[PDB]
Structures are given as structure tokens and as C-alpha cells.
Amino acid sequence: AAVSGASLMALLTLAATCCMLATARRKCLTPYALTPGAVVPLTLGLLCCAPR
Amino acid sequence: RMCMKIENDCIFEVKLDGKVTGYACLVGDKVMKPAHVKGTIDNPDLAKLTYKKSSKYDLECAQIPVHMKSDASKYTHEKPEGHYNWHHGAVQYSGGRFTIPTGAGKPGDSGRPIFDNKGRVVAIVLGGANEGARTALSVVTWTKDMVTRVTPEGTEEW
Amino acid sequence: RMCMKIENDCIFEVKLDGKVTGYACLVGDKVMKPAHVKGTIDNPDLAKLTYKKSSKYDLECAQIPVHMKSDASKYTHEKPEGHYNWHHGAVQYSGGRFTIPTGAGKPGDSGRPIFDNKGRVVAIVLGGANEGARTALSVVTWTKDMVTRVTPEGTEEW
């Protein structure tokens, strides 16, 4: 019981980190995907692993 | 007067339950559609796309097909103080506030471009507020680098 | 007509299998050829040279013989917005993209120079995108210091 509970807390906290970093990426890069003429500054593209 | 020549092929209509709900416009290499405009594009070439929508800018964009870039409208970041062109009437720009004669705005109708005096899309209208005789628009304007959604108090999404 | 001097002084053929595969040009002190153009140069004075390569810029260059520097074309790095002269027509430079009426550029046909309003070469054209009525050129062009390559997606490598 204790190991299953703690390992579920481990997986949930890992998933929360993943969702928070994915949300930060989405919040940062989406304006450059919406704006018609724009392209990301290449340093930020390397940092955020931009798809280009 | 002349900008309707460009609007007639920048615009595609968005249709739901067999009726129009609003528009999408080809701006640069991206199609701009408001997110409140529900339904699907009447053109399969745009309906097949996946749109990187955002709730902050009430906007959905996708990279338009290889061919359709032929007819997409030229944009500009230039927003000089002055006179601007639109389907139902002439827009006036004032310190950031695009404004229109009241009643020229209509339900749906969102997603039309506004054109500058050179025929370039300056921004995409989303709605407007009951600013007396001269409604002020909640159009989503863009800077050199970033979309900067504008919205006056008392907007309705007409 | 005005560029027909610079065209004939700059262009050299690249040919194979009984047909012209593409072209080369004398730009500054460089002989320019696209790296994808397969065959041999029409001129022994160029065909005997040894060339730098790049798979990224898709470009080959060599230092031209000292006599050929008399014929080699004058270049520029400037790109004002507008339109530019080319062997098949006028290339438009809309929004930083070179674009052409579809059907002007043919299969092969690459390695041609593009000229400014003063006859200076400003770009070299590779293939081009099947961009509806307004095919967009894949292009090599240079700044003060660096070569660059512009490649519209959906390019067919003519």
C-alpha cells in the first residue's frame, strides 16, 4: 500500500511538472504561431524546442 | 472601394447548420479565424487544417496550403493615424481605437479584415461596443512581432 | 532590354544528356552554380576549376580566371521592396519573397541571376514552389558578409 501510494504521488508530481512546462511552452510560443508574419527568436526556439 | 477585390479572395465563409457564422481571412502565410466563430470553413482545403487556437486572442491560425498562398492578402504592422477601409463602411483609427458608424456592425460578420489605404490587411475585426453613434471595435491588431488583441469595454461580439 | 548585356556577360550554360540542365553565372569574382544542377560547364575556363560546396545553401563557387573578371557581373546586397528583372519576366519581391507568374520558370532553368533596377545581380534562383498562380522562388542571396538561402515550402526543385 505505502509503495503504491508514494509511487502514484511520484507519477502525479512528474505529470504536474510535465503539464506545467508544456503549458509554459504553449503560453510562450503560441503568439508567434498566431502572428501572421512572425518567427520565433532563434535562441528562444532552441530553448523551447521550437518545431521549425 | 477597391479593397473588395482583395476581400473576395482573402475571405472564406464559416458555416454552421447550413448558415454563415463569420469569416476567415488568408493573411500572409496564415489563415486567421476568430475562435468564437463556431462551425467549419466552406472550403475543405481549410477545414482539413489543424488550428493552433488561443483563448487569450480569441483566434485560430493555421499554415495555409501551398497553392492558397497565391491569393492570400498582404499584411502590414503599419498603423498610422488616419483612414481605413472595411466591408460595411470606412473605419477611422484614433490612437489605437478603430471605430465605425454604429449599426454598420452586424451579428456574425467577425473575421473580416480591415485594409489600409495601400490595400494591406492592418488587422481582423472581432466586434464592437455601443460607443454611441461611433462604435469602437474589439479588432485583434498585430505589431511587428506579436498579435496584441484590443477590446474596449462594453464590447459585444458582433 | 537593359539587362540583356549583363545576362549575356554573366550566364554560362550547364548541359548534359543532350539538353541544358541549368546555368552558371559570373558574379563578382565568383562563378556561381547550384549544387543540384548536374552536368558540365560550357566553358573550359570554368569547367577546369575546383569548387567549394554546400548542401545547405545548395551552392558551388570558385575563383574565376583573371581575364573572366573583366566580364563578370556587378552585384549588390540591397533588396528594396518592389519588383526585379529576370530572364522570363519581372520577379516581384512581395514581403521579402521573390515570386513570379506560374509557368514563367521552367523545369531545370535554375542558376539564373535576378537583377535590380540598375542591372546588378541581387539573387540566384533555384527551384520554386508550385504556389498557384504566383510560384515562389527558392533563392540564394547575400548580405554584406554572408550568403543566405530562402526556400518556400512546397518547392519543386526546378
3-state secondary structure chain C: CCCHHHHHHHEEEEEECCEEEEEEEEECCEEEEECCCCCEECCHHHHCCCCEEECCCCEEEEECCCCHHHCCECECCCCCCCEEEECCEEEEEECCEEECCCCCCCCCCCCCEEECCCCCEEEEEEEEECCCCCCEEEEEEECCCCEEEECCCCEECC
Q: How far apart are CA B124 and CA B114, in angstroms?
A: 6
* Greatest alpha-carbon span in chain A: 55
The neighbours of chain A, by the rule of 3 or more Cβ pairs under 8 Å, are B
**From the CB of residue C154, how many other CB atoms can be counted at a distance below 10 Å?**
15
> Which residue in B has a C-alpha nearest to residue A32's C-alpha?
B146
Answer whether B28 touches C (CB < 8 Å): yes
Q: Which three cell numbers stand for residue C96?
A: 521579402
Q: Which residues are within 8 A (CB) of B103 and not within 5 positions of it... i.e. 6 or more apart?
A: none
Q: How far apart are CA C128 and CA B99, in angstroms?
A: 42
Q: How far apart are CA C139 and CA B153, in angstroms?
A: 48
Q: Test B70 with C153 for CB contact under 8 angstroms.
A: no
Q: How far apart are CA C134 and CA C146, in angstroms?
A: 28
Q: How far apart are CA B38 and CA B16, in angstroms?
A: 7
Catalytic annotation on C58? yes
In angstroms, the Cα distances linking B20 to A6, B33, C89, C113 are 54, 13, 41, 48
Relative to beta strand C147-150, strand C155-156 is unpaired
Q: How far apart are CA C146 and CA C136, in angstroms?
A: 22
Amino acid in the structure at residue B11: I
Which chain C residues have a beta carbon less than 8 Å from that of B71? 132-133
Instruction: Using alpha carbons, select from C153, C70, C60 the residue that is nearest to residue C110.
Output: C60
Catalytic annotation on C36? yes
Answer whether C153 touches B (CB < 8 Å): yes
Instruction: Using alpha carbons, select from B83, B61, B71 the residue that is nearest to residue B1.
Output: B83
- Selecting from B54, B56, B142 the residue whose C-beta is nearest the C-beta of A36 gives B142
Q: Which residues pair with B14 in a beta bridge?
A: B22, B41
Contact C64, C30 (CB under 8 A): yes
Contact C34, C59 (CB under 8 A): yes
**Residue in the structure block whose three cell numbers are 533588396:** C79
Which chain C residues have a beta carbon less than 8 Å from that of B67? 130-132
Contact C157, C107 (CB under 8 A): no
* Buried residues in C14-30 as b, exposed as e (16+ CB within 10 A): bbeeeeebbbbbbbeeb
Secondary structure class of B82 (helix, strand, coil): coil
Instruction: Using alpha carbons, select from B142, B40, B56, B19 the residue that is nearest to residue A35.
Output: B142
Q: How far apart are CA C87 and CA C89, in angstroms?
A: 6
> Which residue in A has a C-alpha nearest to residue B29's C-alpha?
A36
Q: How far apart are CA C19 and CA B109, in angstroms?
A: 56
In this structure, what are the phi and psi dihedrals at residue C69, rounded to the nearest 5 degrees?
Answer: -60, -20
- Selecting from B28, B70, B75 the residue whose C-beta is nearest the C-beta of C132 gives B70
Instruction: Using alpha carbons, select from B86, B88, B29, B89 the residue that is nearest to residue B61.
Output: B29
The conformational region for residue B107 under phi > 0 = left, psi -120 to 50 = alpha, else beta, is beta
Segment 60-99 of chain C within 8 Å of chain B by CB: 94-95
